[PDB]
From Swiss-Prot:
Function: Seems to be essential for minus-strand RNAs and subgenomic 26S mRNAs synthesis. Displays mono-ADP-ribosylhydrolase activity. ADP-ribosylation is a post-translational modification that controls various processes of the host cell and the virus probably needs to revert it for optimal viral replication. Binds proteins of G3BP family and sequesters them into the viral RNA replication complexes thereby inhibiting the formation of host stress granules on viral mRNAs.
Subcellular location per the Swiss-Prot or TrEMBL entry: Host cytoplasmic vesicle membrane
Quaternary data: Interacts with mRNA-capping enzyme nsP1. Interacts (via C-terminus) with host G3BP1; this interaction inhibits the formation of host stress granules on viral mRNAs and the nsp3-G3BP1 complexes bind viral RNAs and probably orchestrate the assembly of viral replication complexes. Interacts (via C-terminus) with host G3BP2; this interaction inhibits the formation of host stress granules on viral mRNAs and the nsp3-G3BP2 complexes bind viral RNAs and probably orchestrate the assembly of viral replication complexes. Interacts (via C-terminus) with host NAP1L1.
Range within the parent protein: 1334 to 1493 of 2474
Protein name: Non-structural protein 3
Length: 163
């Protein structure tokens, strides 16, 4: 574990992370996809060997010795708000299990279902709270990666609020 397990947020490409493993915002079919998924495919293409996994699950594939945890959030275009919320919480619980199993001291993680799977809605708080619910009991340093300057400020505020 980390000596003093923390949350941090960085506004930069998760493919440039400084952590011991990465979570991909994956699609269920293991396709190169868009956004985070495409950046992960460009950086760690070997990790897409048999990475297909259902919605609400996480499947880890090694790129060399570097673990890529493929976490499949729901596409809120397809799911009801209720079912989508349930699957989004489940994907993050599976990420916590994988991070624990791998024995890493740090993990780079995007906010699941906040991009092209958001169904055109702002799900920062929904997705981040589910991240917290899953990751709070882990002792890895968690580094959240985002794109948007305003999201960086809001994620940083939510982290600092609870310390
Ligand atoms: Cl891919 C990506 C993530 C965060 C910040 C960025 N600036 C230019 N590209 C970026
Ligand atoms: C985080 C958010 C959106 C796009 C990205 N590309 C690489 N990392 C990213
Ligand atoms: Cl997404």
């Amino acid at each position: 574990g980390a000596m003093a397990p923390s949350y941090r947020v960085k506004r930069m490409d998760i493919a440039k992370n400084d952590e011991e493993c990465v979570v991909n915002a994956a699609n269920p079919r293991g396709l190169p996809g868009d956004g985070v998924c495409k950046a992960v495919y460009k950086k760690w293409p070997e990790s897409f060997k048999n990475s297909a996994t259902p919605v609400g699950t996480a499947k880890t594939v090694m790129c060399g010795t570097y673990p890529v945890i493929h976490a499949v959030g729901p596409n809120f275009s397809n799911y009801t708000e209720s079912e989508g919320d349930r699957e989004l919480a489940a994907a993050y619980r599976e990420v916590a299990k994988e991070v624990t199993r791998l024995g890493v001291n740090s993990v780079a993680i995007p906010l699941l279902s906040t991009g092209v799977y958001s169904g055109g809605k702002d799900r920062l708080t929904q997705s981040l709270n589910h991240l917290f619910t899953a990751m709070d009991s882990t002792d890895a340093d968690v580094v959240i990666y985002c794109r948007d300057k305003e999201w960086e400020k809001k994620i940083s505020e939510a982290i600092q609020m609870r310390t």
